[PDB]
Design a protein around this ligand. Structure first.
Ligand SMILES: Cc1cc2nc3c(=O)[nH]c(=O)nc-3n(C[C@H](O)[C@H](O)[C@H](O)COP(=O)(O)OP(=O)(O)OC[C@H]3O[C@@H](n4cnc5c(N)ncnc54)[C@H](O)[C@@H]3O)c2cc1C
Ligand SMILES: [Cl-]
Length: 381
């Protein structure tokens, strides 16, 4: 009984993590990534306890300790007055409650740590997938350059515009939010004038029509920011935050060339898997960035999918892909819905609804425990 050889399309967090996770449990997995080399851009992400646990399982948490940063609190700030509307301490309480720390870190750092632990030799650069056809015993991936690679299982981790998803279920439009995210890492030495940044904090500035998130990365030496605005040029971004507190305007004014990303997600899908092909990460369940969980969820996907594929033979692959999907879909669906809800919530004008939002924010540790406190390993059979 042959154990499956596994081809993974995409070398982002999701693809690296699942390849790394498969190999750690004795399955041969190989990544096909379209880019000629992996980027060192892409700014900051937040790793919750739930994702931290996935990184421990995959053996990469120890390598990320240095470049991680440990926000002491989540501080929800009024757009105009700069007052702390709601605050929750993370130092100690977060780890005690949910079983692991809250980290903020560069995307690229997480990507690099995964790449190293997996081994770069397991990643084919320059391989752009254009398609996947199911065979009788497995599947074969088509590349742009005419190539092919057959396998006992194929995992589509090729992002929100997944070639693998298109092949399996046909054309499907990504859903535009009507907002853009501007993202940047600002060196802290360009922000000496901003005294709030003396403490490491997860900042969430909430206001009318738009919002602004900031946090430290690289052990406190740079500050990530994400500015979500109705929909790139720095002048138009600075203007969209006219009237806001100096903290926001000063941080925006310290980056000449921020990155702009139209923010899309997709409707939840009833089906991810077809014979020996399945999806993972943004390809399976793309969400807006408003829970800070997309990477976290790709990591959960990776752990769970590696578990099922490490325990089967070639003939058990379809069943294993369906078991992964059946466990992962409901959770990701709720996060998708939640991330949409939060886009609205973060952008209310001043008024009763915003005051009611603020009230429900007081009970946030209970209300999001299902996310941060989730034990991925304990969810398995
Ligand atoms: C502004 C913003 C802020 C965010 N903040 C957070 C946060 O705080 N916390 C969090 O957990 N998540 C966050 N996310 C979400 C997170 O970045 C993603 O969910 C996560 O990186 C998705 O990883 P992935 O591997 O599924 O996909 P991607 O990172 O999209 O990787 C896909 C890979 O596949 C490759 N590829 C694509 N098509 C092909 C092809 N046809 N053939 C071969 N290779 C291909 C790409 O080159 C890429 O390397 C944020 C997202 C945004 C937009
Ligand atoms: Cl996200």
């Amino acid at each position: 009984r042959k154990r499956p050889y596994v081809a993974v399309v995409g070398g982002g967090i999701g693809g690296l993590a699942v390849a790394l996770g498969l190999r750690r449990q004795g399955v041969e997995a190989v990544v096909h990534e379209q880019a000629h080399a992996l980027s060192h851009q892409g700014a900051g992400i937040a790793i919750g306890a739930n994702g931290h646990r996935a990184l421990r399982e995959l053996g990469v948490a120890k390598r990320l300790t240095a470049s991680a940063a440990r926000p002491s609190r989540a501080d929800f700030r009024h757009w105009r007055t700069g007052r702390s509307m709601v605050s929750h301490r993370l130092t100690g309480l977060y780890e005690e409650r949910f079983g692991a720390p809250f980290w903020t870190v560069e995307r690229a750092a997480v990507q690099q740590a995964l790449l190293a632990e997996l081994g770069p030799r397991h990643v084919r650069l320059g391989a752009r997938c254009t398609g996947v056809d199911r065979t009788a015993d497995g599947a074969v991936i088509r590349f742009e350059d005419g190539g092919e690679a057959e396998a006992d299982a194929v995992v589509g981790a090729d992002g929100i515009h997944s070639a693998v998803r298109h092949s399996l279920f046909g054309p499907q439009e990504a859903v535009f939010s009507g907002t853009s995210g501007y993202r940047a890492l600002v060196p802290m030495d360009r922000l000496r004038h901003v005294p709030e940044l003396a403490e490491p904090v997860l900042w969430l500035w909430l206001g009318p029509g738009r919002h602004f998130i900031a946090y430290p990365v690289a052990d406190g030496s740079a500050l990530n920011f994400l500015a979500v605005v109705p929909d790139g040029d720095a002048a138009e971004l600075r203007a969209a935050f006219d009237g806001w507190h100096p903290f926001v305007t000063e941080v925006l004014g310290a980056c000449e060339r921020p990155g702009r990303w139209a923010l899309y997600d997709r409707e939840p899908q009833r089906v991810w898997s077809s014979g020996a092909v399945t999806l993972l990460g943004d390809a399976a369940h793309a969400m807006l960035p408003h829970h800070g969980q997309g990477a976290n969820q790709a990591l959960e996907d990776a752990v769970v999918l590696a578990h099922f594929l490490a325990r089967t033979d070639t003939g058990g692959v379809p069943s294993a892909l369906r078991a992964y999907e059946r466990l992962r879909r409901p959770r990701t669906r709720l996060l998708q819905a939640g991330s949409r809800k939060n886009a609205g919530c973060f952008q209310l004008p001043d008024g009763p609804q915003a005051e009611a939002r603020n009230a429900r924010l007081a009970t946030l540790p209970d209300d999001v425990a299902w996310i941060h406190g989730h034990d991925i390993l304990g969810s398995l059979p």
